[PDB]
Amino acid sequence: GAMAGVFTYETEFTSVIPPPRLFKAFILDADNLIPKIAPQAVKCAEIIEGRGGVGTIKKITFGEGSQFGSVTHKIDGIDKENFVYSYSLIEGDALSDKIEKISYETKLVSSSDGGSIIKSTSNYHTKGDVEIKEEHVKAGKEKASHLFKLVEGYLLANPNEYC
Ligand SMILES: [Cl-]
């Protein structure tokens, strides 16, 4: 029986937008917001099974920017009051014989200056010898980063939304 392990990588950035508005727009309204403002990034998001809570299975189809590829996510948890959203990658290019699943956690933390700290944890569920490239991981972190800036810009330009 092959070695089962977990490789954990955590990363953070800041936003001028405080957690309640950021969690409502960027996290809870991702399916509707991102295809609408960034069609090149996301073509659409479709719920396959569930209502939007824990256990929900959803397929995200990318735009031209990611060669109309796609990812399938399972929602592992949602804590609206603490701004925590957990989900697993259950179908995607990042999975292999070596990486069977990636569980992510996005947590919004408030700061005293009125902003947010966006804390992203990636947990890679490994099988056998572990061979994880820093370039492969950091391209995934850059990806999430440049997209967030499009969301942040839009929310600043449309202050009446997600209040
Ligand atoms: Cl990238």
Ligand 1 centre to CA of 134 (Å) is 12
C-alpha–C-alpha distance, residues 132 and 137, integer Å: 8
SS3 for 119-143 is: EEEEEEEEECCCCCCHHHHHHHHHH
Residue closest to 38 by CA, chosen among 119, 137, 152: 152
Ligand 1 centre to CA of 11 (Å) is 15
Q: What is the CATH number of the domain that holds 110?
A: 3.30.530.20
DSSP bridge pairs for 127:
4
Q: How many residues are present in the chain?
A: 163
Find out whether 109 and 119 touch, Cβ atoms under 8 Å: yes
Residue 18: exposure state from Cβ atoms within 10 A (0-12, 13-18, ≥19): middle
Give this entry's resolution in angstroms: 2.0
Ligand 1 centre to CA of 112 (Å) is 31
Q: Which long-range contacts (CB under 8 A, 24 or more apart) does 145-148 make?
A: 145/13, 147/34, 147/38, 147/41, 148/13, 148/15, 148/26, 148/118
Ligand 1 centre to CA of 109 (Å) is 25
Burial 76-95 (b: 16+ CB within 10 A, else e): eebeeeebbbbbbbbeeeeb
Find out whether 121 and 9 touch, Cβ atoms under 8 Å: yes
Ligand 1 centre to CA of 84 (Å) is 24
Which residues touch 106 (CB under 8 Å, ≥6 apart)?
27, 84, 85, 86, 118, 119, 120
Q: Tell me the CB-side half-sphere exposure of residue 69, using CA atoms within 13 A.
A: 8
Query: What domain range is 26 assigned to?
Result: 1-163
The maximal CA–CA distance of the chain, rounded, in angstroms, is 55
Find out whether 66 and 41 touch, Cβ atoms under 8 Å: yes
Determination technique for this PDB entry?
X-ray
Ligand 1 centre to CA of 49 (Å) is 29
The domain tally of the chain equals 1
